[PDB]
Design a protein around this ligand. Structure first.
Ligand SMILES: CCCCCCCCCCCCCCCCCC(=O)OC[C@H](COP(=O)([O-])OCC(O)COP(=O)([O-])OC[C@@H](COC(=O)CCCCCCCCCCCCCCCCC)OC(=O)CCCCCCCCCCCCCCCCC)OC(=O)CCCCCCCCCCCCCCCCC
Ligand SMILES: CCCCCCCCCCCCCCCCCC(=O)OC[C@H](COP(=O)([O-])OCC[N+](C)(C)C)OC(=O)CCCCCCCCCCCCCCCCC
Ligand SMILES: CCCCCCCCCCCCCCCCCC(=O)OC[C@H](COP(=O)([O-])OCC[N+](C)(C)C)OC(=O)CCCCCCCCCCCCCCCCC
Ligand SMILES: CCCCCCCCCCCCCCCCCC(=O)OC[C@H](COP(=O)([O-])OCC[N+](C)(C)C)OC(=O)CCCCCCCCCCCCCCCCC
Ligand SMILES: CCCCCCCCCCCCCCCCCC(=O)OC[C@H](COP(=O)(O)OCCN)OC(=O)CCCCCCCCCCCCCCCCC
Ligand SMILES: CCCCCCCCCCCCCCCCCC(=O)OC[C@H](COP(=O)(O)OCCN)OC(=O)CCCCCCCCCCCCCCCCC
Ligand SMILES: CS(=O)(=O)C1CCN(c2cccc(Cn3cc(-c4nc(-c5ccc(OC(F)(F)F)cc5)no4)ccc3=O)c2)CC1
Ligand code: SF4
Ligand code: SF4
Ligand code: SF4
Lengths: 97, 115, 156, 318, 80, 56, 70, 178, 360
């Protein structure tokens, strides 16, 4: 029972990131694969997701893009790649994206 | 021969590790680095001075207890003997005398450390 | 099978090791040590990144100058740094360590730890948010990503 | 073929030491409400290799106050013995069948202390000497009860051989008749390894690192891996003596499987305990082992001397 | 005295148990009916060869063959 | 909350407390990040009569 | 969550299972599909040397049965 | 009022049940098993660890991090070289030199902040009567060089031109509480 | 390893605070009291503000006082967390640190919301507080306080009834009441010995005397009784926070006297008098009539006091900080007599030592 439902959630997580290539992309450049709603995508390619069922520090997150002003950011990412429009939101200073 | 083989293999593994630890990395040696560590400041003396021992009596006692253990270890064989009453009696006497010595030390405060 | 390519990949490996395993030193002087702790706390798990506080300089790889550096303490700091084995990095945490900070014009403060030791990264704040200190740790990780030592040896 | 068997016994033990450091970190993290390494690799399966490679890439230290000979010998010996204690172990078939395997274990373990002693003395630093003397006290404390516990257990096995315990437990664990001795042996193995609550030889809160304080990357790695190997070794000893895997001569693989399960359980318990408790004071360890464990140990030794007699249950000599 | 034993069982039960087990180890052999069998078993084991004797013709109590019904039987050990 | 009726029982027994009712994490039981605007009040010395600083 | 720990535990479990199975299979492969004979007392060693000698090749695990008494 | 923490102990009454309970506690290690159980419970809880730098720690509009000089919506600078910010800056981190701009307005030529002296106290933005100097939310501005942390007028102006979309909203939120 | 003498060599963190302060104004000097004891900040701000208000002869308003008490008790909880957990770490137990710092982070969030800083909030100021509470903060404080007791219970389960913690903290570092008074102890170092003294019931300094709470008292002046006193003081801080939440009055937050506390922005930008007063308070400051006070509060470490001398100027002529920890550390050689190294660690811990106030 319960294990069946948690395993189905895990299968949704594994399969709900594009395919295998995207799953591995996210797992190896973000170290987490949990799935959440999409809020927006900035001109720099950074995607912003939301899942309010998680706890406070984990209900909003980002997937930094691979290229930002000529810097290959597939591996080398930093929090400074977040524009201000989304800074005030991601840092939970506002409930309004 | 196989025990020798295994143990020498382990010697060689350890020594290889130490060799490649002492000859692979880049070094930059100077006195302030190679000097002893005493929490940021300079030692007031050498560590080769008498470091008093407060459990010396307990260590001395540990010697004799180790010997009593050496005398207790042949029991697995002593129990295969026809004279079983003698083995039983001697083992009981040995352990009892050991415990009595320990109790005398305890009471006379030998197991407690000099302060 | 070019030796230059092989050396670049080997250096990538060297830096990956020295980077994903950064053992700092339990060296906290003032308030900023509290944010250091908080960066060791659940919300920001250091070990998650491979970071581990070892108390002996002979085992550490980086030292975070987490607070004010007085003239009575500078000799000990330089001694500890000297005792850390190369490769050794340094991180200045706060405004006291960078330039003396709120005590810059005092008679018992060195106006910057960069006078006593060489500093790789400066983390501003009074105190720096533990998130900021983590940002600095990762900035250091990248700086290490860009050491290119064996390429230099091969070019010599 | 024997060298291939040496490899199949050695390289997995080192991989297991590495992933034991991993499991230690992750278990302690989740107990501390944190994750533990998940960045370096998938769920952190590369952090140990990173640490080891980084250490063997660092500048080692050849201080000015040290006796370099012992300073270098001690870690060699530590690692050597940590790897040599694994040879006479039946899983269920050992690489070296010794009749006096228990005594080999005892002697090699009592010898591994001289690595700490000589390291701390050579280093020629006060904290190193303190760690060395604390190791002296710790050994003087636990070594008395170790052998008597072990003898009292073996008096139903019939020999010091590690392969007769398998036929002894063929029907029922040795924990039921000897769970007091099992508890005392567990804590004494906890002490033999200088492991919490008995992490006094390297007590970071009193002695910055103890005998390691002057040691650097490579030799320090040797010390550390020797520690984390002896951990698994003592867990395997507990689970070969007091816990008995299923031995069916046509199925030794099941024996190895259950042995591994129990060893993992006991090691995870070691980590649990490190996470759950404060640290002793090294006089209280002596007082414990000499006032609560030694009297009871003698009483139980006499009890197990008599039990085979008034039960007619004397074991056989082969 | 009961109060002393009681406050010891509360305070220092380890020594109480130690003395009790000491006494039981010393006593139970005097109590059991299976104590006599230890030496009998350790004697029944043929760690050496049973050197035979010369048939002088005056050994009626001694057997001419293992399966000859004479000598010590081990039934007491076959069903014990 | 993500727990599944069995881990919850296990940890409540191990700890001896009803943890599920008291969690170390904040699940929507917290004030929002976007509050309405306030209208702060004023103190007593905001009058227009019998307010001379020589008295107060 | 806590189940993020099973990878390391499984790796170490495999690594701790390998030694025993390897020793057993190698003993079988080297001692003629049999368990390595244990010599705890001199009698067993005598038996093994007898077997070594009678076996055409000096190896104790080549068992010679009733095919070799006529 | 007061209470006792370790004087609760009253006169001694002892039974066989109490003695046996204390004996089991001393022999089976009851109280330690409970700590083991607590640590176990924590193993099966959700860790509070966030996945930085992807998901980040919360903050509030009042957060005072990196400094920036703002402008009026027309593009004109808000600073008028009144020098309250450097008059109160308790670290003496601000440095100002004013001069009549060609159009005659009162403006600065120098406006420097040693961010190695700033204690990030906020006095400058509560002293500024034109809401020009602010302490923005950005805290991820570490450097590899000490010199980079000595901001001038151009750096602060660029920061203002970089974060205005956030600074202005946080102000709009917090300016009634002041 | 038996100790025969302890010679504490403080001064590795002296900074000249008491001189820079002379070179600053009062507001311009407030943050030093945050930077002094960096785990009990608001209490130091509160002592400084109370002294300056005494010298000014003004009374902060009710709401500001209630907020001061609220955050003072929150800081008591912070500091007792830090003390107990570093004590344990230095003794071996490491998990309580991680369990309770997740709560310290939430209280830092409270700080940040109300001030903008997590740690050094120059929030408590002469006249009250800089800025009113933001909507929705008391609810979160309630949600935190309704659960914190459970974490205290977990920690106590790890420590209180554990024979190892006891063997490490029992009969260790004993202090007699008369020796404590003489050596100049204050707070837990005084109560654990059985002395009935608390500057919140005696010499109250805020709405204390409007809020009920119990003082925990020890019998054996050992590290164990002090640890228990600290745990129970945290529980009583919860008891106090409950009342501060339920009964918090409406009104203003800073004295309605714009020659001490600056005026609001909207009034500065339309009123001439308020603009003048803002300009002057933020460039020159407020002149303080001459005199000298010694104001002391019950900081979580003990009696924290400031002797503040004033000319008729905007800058203090002399400001000494009396730190709880100076005398506590001076008493180490005595409390360590007949003990070992690990015991000396335990004793360093049971004093709740911070050196920003000792060396300052
Ligand atoms: C395996 C089963 C044991 C682990 C488990 O999660 O199920 C036990 C299940 C989960 O307990 P829980 O902590 O309350 O669940 C947390 C949330 O529900 C977690 O729910 P969620 O919504 O966050 O999504 C969880 C999702 C996670 O999504 C994934 O697929 C990632 C799995 C991690 C792989 C590493 O699915 C799973 O967790 C399945 C776990 C499968 C085991 C993965 C580790 C084995 C690695 C193999 C080594 C090679 O509890 C039980 O049913 C009883 C325990 C069973 C004893 C074994
Ligand atoms: C000894 C074991 C072998 C070590 C293999 C190293 C593999 C590196 C790795 O796992 O991460 C990929 C690494 C990732 O590097 P990274 O450090 O930038 O990854 C961080 C990504 N975030 C921040 C999102 C978590 O890939 C590389 O950069 C190359 C390093 C290894 C090069 C060795 C080539 C041979
Ligand atoms: C069981 C234990 C497993 C762990 C051990 C496994 C470790 C194996 C690592 C293999 C990587 C091999 C390359 C490591 C070399 C790192 C040494 C180094 O950084 O020195 C740089 C040195 C620096 O050379 P350099 O000539 O530029 O130095 C100039 C002088 N200084 C440094 C003062 C400016 O480069 C080398 O010379 C090493 C060449 C690489 C090949 C060496 C063999
Ligand atoms: C069995 C013990 C051997 C008894 C016979 C003595 C044989 C060795 C004597 C040679 C001198 C060694 C010596 O004492 O030097 C001091 C040194 C102490 O260091 P050190 O003082 O010589 O430091 C010298 C520093 N350098 C290297 C730069 C010059 O210790 C030793 O070398 C001997 C330690 C005894 C180890 C014996 C076991 C050997 C294991 C096989 C390898
Ligand atoms: C060199 C400097 C470093 C030195 C440190 C080396 C590591 C030391 C490891 C600790 C060893 C201490 C214990 C002594 C060795 C164990 C003896 C032993 O187990 O028995 C020897 C073995 C036969 O033993 P047994 O089974 O009882 O007899 C019946 C066999 N049918 O068969 C034998 O007779 C073999 C005896 C050789 C023992 C191995 C010693 C190797 C030394 C290498 C150096
Ligand atoms: C007819 C019967 C005949 C047979 C005779 C035998 C009869 C049964 C007798 C049963 C006796 C009980 C078993 C004996 C073991 C316990 C020994 C003991 O009680 O030591 C207690 C000791 C002192 O505790 P303390 O509270 O300080 O009291 C001091 C005295 N005033 O403190 C201690 O020693 C314990 C403290 C150790 C702390 C280290 C961490 C412990 C970790 C706990 C892990 C538990 C998991 C066990 C796993 C075992 C699996 C192998
Ligand atoms: C606050 S806490 O409770 O969280 C606290 C708990 C304890 N903790 C912890 C536990 C385990 C390890 C470490 C990292 N660590 C690793 C090494 C060290 N490791 C190897 C090594 C060699 C060969 C190996 O295998 C192979 F390479 F294949 F051969 C693998 C490894 N050498 O050195 C030495 C020192 C050290 O601190 C840290 C985290 C923090
Ligand atoms: S920079 Fe600020 S927080 Fe850091 S040590 Fe200095 S005064 Fe304390
Ligand atoms: S925040 Fe404070 S210290 Fe920093 S520049 Fe502004 S007034 Fe100066
Ligand atoms: S307070 Fe504002 S307007 Fe005045 S000088 Fe400073 S930045 Fe310019």
């Amino acid at each position: 029972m319960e294990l069946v439902e948690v395993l189905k959630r895990g299968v949704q997580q594994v399969t709900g990131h594009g395919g295998l290539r995207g799953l591995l992309r996210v797992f190896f450049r973000a170290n987490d694969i949990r799935i959440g709603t999409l809020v927006g995508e900035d001109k720099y390619g950074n995607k912003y997701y939301e899942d309010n069922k998680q706890f406070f520090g984990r209900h909003r997150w980002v997937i930094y893009t691979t290229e930002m002003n000529g810097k290959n950011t597939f591996w080398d990412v930093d929090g400074s790649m977040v524009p201000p429009e989304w800074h005030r939101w991601l840092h939970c200073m506002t409930d309004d994206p | 021969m196989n025990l020798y083989t295994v143990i020498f293999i382990n010697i060689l593994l350890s020594l290889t590790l130490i060799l490649v630890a002492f000859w692979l990395p880049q070094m930059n040696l100077y006195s302030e680095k190679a000097n002893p560590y005493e929490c940021g400041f300079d030692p007031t003396s050498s560590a080769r001075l008498p470091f008093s021992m407060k459990f010396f009596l307990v260590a001395i006692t540990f010697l004799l207890f180790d010997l009593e253990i050496a005398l207790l270890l042949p029991l697995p064989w002593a129990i295969q003997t026809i004279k079983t009453s003698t083995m039983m009696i001697m083992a009981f006497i040995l352990v009892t005398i050991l415990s009595l010595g320990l109790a005398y030390e305890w009471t006379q405060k030998g197991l407690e450390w000099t302060e | 099978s070019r030796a230059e390519y092989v050396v670049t990949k080997l250096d990538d490996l060297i830096n990956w090791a020295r980077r994903s395993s950064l053992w700092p030193m339990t060296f906290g002087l003032a308030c900023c040590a509290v944010e250091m702790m908080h960066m060791a706390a659940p919300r920001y798990d250091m070990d998650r990144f491979g970071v581990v506080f070892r108390a002996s300089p002979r085992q550490a790889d980086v030292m975070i100058v987490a607070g004010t550096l007085t003239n009575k303490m500078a000799p000990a700091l330089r001694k500890v740094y000297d005792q850390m084995p190369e490769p050794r990095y340094v991180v200045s945490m706060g405004s006291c360590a960078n330039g003396g900070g709120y005590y810059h014009y005092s008679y018992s403060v060195v106006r910057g730890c960069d006078r006593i030791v060489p500093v790789d990264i400066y983390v501003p704040g009074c105190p720096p948010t533990a998130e900021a200190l983590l940002y600095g740790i990762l900035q250091l990780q990248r700086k290490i990503k860009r050491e290119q030592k064996l390429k230099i040896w091969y070019r010599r | 073929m024997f060298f291939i068997n040496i490899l199949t016994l050695l390289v997995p033990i080192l991989i297991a030491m590495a992933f034991l450091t991993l499991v230690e970190r992750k278990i302690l993290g989740y107990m501390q409400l944190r994750k533990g390494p998940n960045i370096v690799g998938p769920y952190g399966i590369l952090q140990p290799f990173a640490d080891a490679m980084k250490l063997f890439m660092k500048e080692p230290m050849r201080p000015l106050t040290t006796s370099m000979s012992l300073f270098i010998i001690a870690p060699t010996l530590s690692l050597t013995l940590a790897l040599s204690l694994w040879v006479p172990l039946p899983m269920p078939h050992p690489l070296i069948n010794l009749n006096l395997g228990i005594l080999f274990i005892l002697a090699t373990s009592s010898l591994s202390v001289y690595s700490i002693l000589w390291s701390g003395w050579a280093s020629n630093s006060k904290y190193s000497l303190f760690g060395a003397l604390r190791a002296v006290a710790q050994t003087i404390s636990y070594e008395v009860t170790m052998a008597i516990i072990l003898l009292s257990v073996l008096l139903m096995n019939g020999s010091y051989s590690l392969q007769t315990l398998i036929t002894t437990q063929e029907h029922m664990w040795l924990l039921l008749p000897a769970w007091p001795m099992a508890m005392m042996w567990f804590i004494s193995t906890l002490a033999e390894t200088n492991r919490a609550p008995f992490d006094l030889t390297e007590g970071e809160s009193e002695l910055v690192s103890g005998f390691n304080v002057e040691y650097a990357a490579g030799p320090f790695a040797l010390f550390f891996m020797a520690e984390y190997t002896n951990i698994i070794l003592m867990n395997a000893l507990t689970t070969i003596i007091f816990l008995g895997p299923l031995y069916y001569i046509n199925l030794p693989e099941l024996y190895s499987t259950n042995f591994m399960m129990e060893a993992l359980l006991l090691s995870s318990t070691f980590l649990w305990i490190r996470a759950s408790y404060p640290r002793f004071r090294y006089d209280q360890l002596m007082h414990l082992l000499w006032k609560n464990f030694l009297p009871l140990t003698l009483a139980l030794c006499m009890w197990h001397i008599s039990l085979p007699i008034f039960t007619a249950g004397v074991p056989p000599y082969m | 005295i009961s109060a002393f034993l009681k406050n010891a069982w509360a305070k220092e039960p380890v020594l109480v148990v130690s003395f009790s087990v000491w006494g039981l180890a010393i006593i139970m052999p005097m109590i059991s009916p299976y104590t006599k069998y230890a030496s009998m078993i350790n004697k029944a084991t043929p760690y050496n060869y049973p050197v035979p004797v010369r048939d002088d013709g005056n050994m009626p109590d001694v057997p001419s063959h293992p399966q000859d019904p004479l000598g010590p039987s081990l039934d007491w050990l076959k069903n014990l | 909350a993500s727990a599944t009726r069995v881990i919850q029982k296990l940890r409540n027994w191990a700890s001896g407390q009803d943890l599920q009712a008291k969690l170390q994490l904040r699940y929507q039981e917290i004030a929002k990040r976007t509050q309405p605007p306030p209208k702060l009040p004023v103190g007593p010395s905001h009058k227009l009569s019998n307010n001379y600083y020589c008295t107060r | 969550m806590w189940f993020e720990i099973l990878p390391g535990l499984a790796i170490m479990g495999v690594c701790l299972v390998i030694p025993g199975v390897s020793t057993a299979y190698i003993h079988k492969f080297t001692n003629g599909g049999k368990e390595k004979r244990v010599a705890r007392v001199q009698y067993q060693w005598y038996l093994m040397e007898r077997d070594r000698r009678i076996s055409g090749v000096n190896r104790y695990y080549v068992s010679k049965g009733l095919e070799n008494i006529d | 009022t007061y209470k006792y923490v370790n004087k609760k102990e009253q006169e001694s009454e002892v039974d066989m049940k109490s003695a046996t309970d204390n004996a089991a506690r001393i022999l089976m290690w009851t109280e330690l098993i409970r700590g083991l159980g607590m640590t176990l419970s924590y193993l099966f809880r959700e860790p509070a660890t966030i996945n930085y730098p992807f998901e980040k720690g919360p903050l509030s509009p009042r957060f005072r991090g990196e400094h920036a000089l703002r402008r009026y919506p027309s593009g004109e600078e808000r600073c008028i070289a009144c020098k309250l910010c450097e008059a109160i800056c308790p670290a003496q981190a601000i440095t100002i030199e004013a001069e009549p701009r060609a159009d005659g307005s009162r403006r600065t030529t120098r406006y420097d902040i040693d961010m190695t002296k700033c204690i990030y106290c906020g006095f400058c933005q509560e002293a500024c009567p034109v809401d020009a100097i602010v302490e923005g939310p950005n805290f991820e501005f570490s450097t590899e060089t000490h010199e980079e942390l000595l901001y001038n007028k151009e750096k602060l102006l660029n920061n203002g031109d970089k974060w205005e979309a956030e600074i202005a909203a946080n102000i709009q939120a917090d300016y009634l509480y002041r | 390893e038996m100790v025969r003498k302890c010679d504490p060599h403080i001064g590795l963190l002296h900074r000249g605070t008491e001189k820079l302060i002379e070179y600053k104004t009062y507001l311009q000097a407030l943050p030093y009291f945050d930077r002094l004891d960096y785990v009990s900040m608001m209490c130091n701000e509160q002592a400084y503000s109370i002294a300056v208000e005494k010298l000014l002869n003004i009374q902060p308003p009710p709401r500001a006082q209630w907020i001061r008490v609220l955050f003072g008790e929150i800081t008591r909880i912070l500091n007792h967390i830090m003390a107990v957990t570093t004590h344990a770490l230095d003794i071996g137990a490491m998990t309580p640190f991680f369990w309770m710092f997740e709560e310290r982070e939430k209280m830092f969030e409270f700080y940040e919301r109300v001030s903008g800083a997590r740690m050094h909030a120059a929030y408590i100021r002469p006249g009250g507080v800089h800025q009113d509470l933001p909507l929705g903060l008391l609810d979160d404080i309630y949600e935190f306080s309704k659960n914190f007791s459970l974490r205290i219970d977990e920690v106590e389960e790890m420590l209180t009834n554990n024979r190892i913690w006891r063997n490490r903290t029992v009969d260790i570092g004993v202090v007699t009441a008369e020796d404590a008074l003489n050596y100049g102890f204050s707070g837990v170092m005084l109560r654990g010995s059985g002395i009935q003294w608390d500057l919140r019931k005696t010499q109250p300094y805020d709405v204390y005397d409007q809020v009920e709470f119990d003082v925990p008292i020890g019998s054996r002046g050992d590290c164990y009784d002090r640890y228990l006193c600290r745990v129970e003081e945290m529980r009583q801080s919860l008891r106090i926070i409950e009342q501060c939440l339920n009964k918090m009055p409406p009104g203003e937050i800073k004295v309605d006297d714009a020659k001490v506390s600056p005026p609001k922005r909207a009034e500065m930008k339309t009123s001439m008098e308020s603009l003048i007063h803002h300009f002057k308070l933020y460039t020159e400051g407020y002149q303080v009539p001459p005199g000298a006070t010694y104001t002391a509060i019950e900081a979580p470490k003990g009696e924290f006091g400031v002797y503040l001398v004033s000319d008729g100027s905007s800058r203090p002529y002399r400001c000494k900080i009396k730190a709880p920890g100076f005398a506590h550390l001076a008493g180490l050689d005595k409390m360590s007599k007949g003990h070992m190294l690990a015991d000396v660690v335990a004793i360093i811990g049971t004093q709740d030592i911070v050196f920003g106030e000792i060396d300052r």
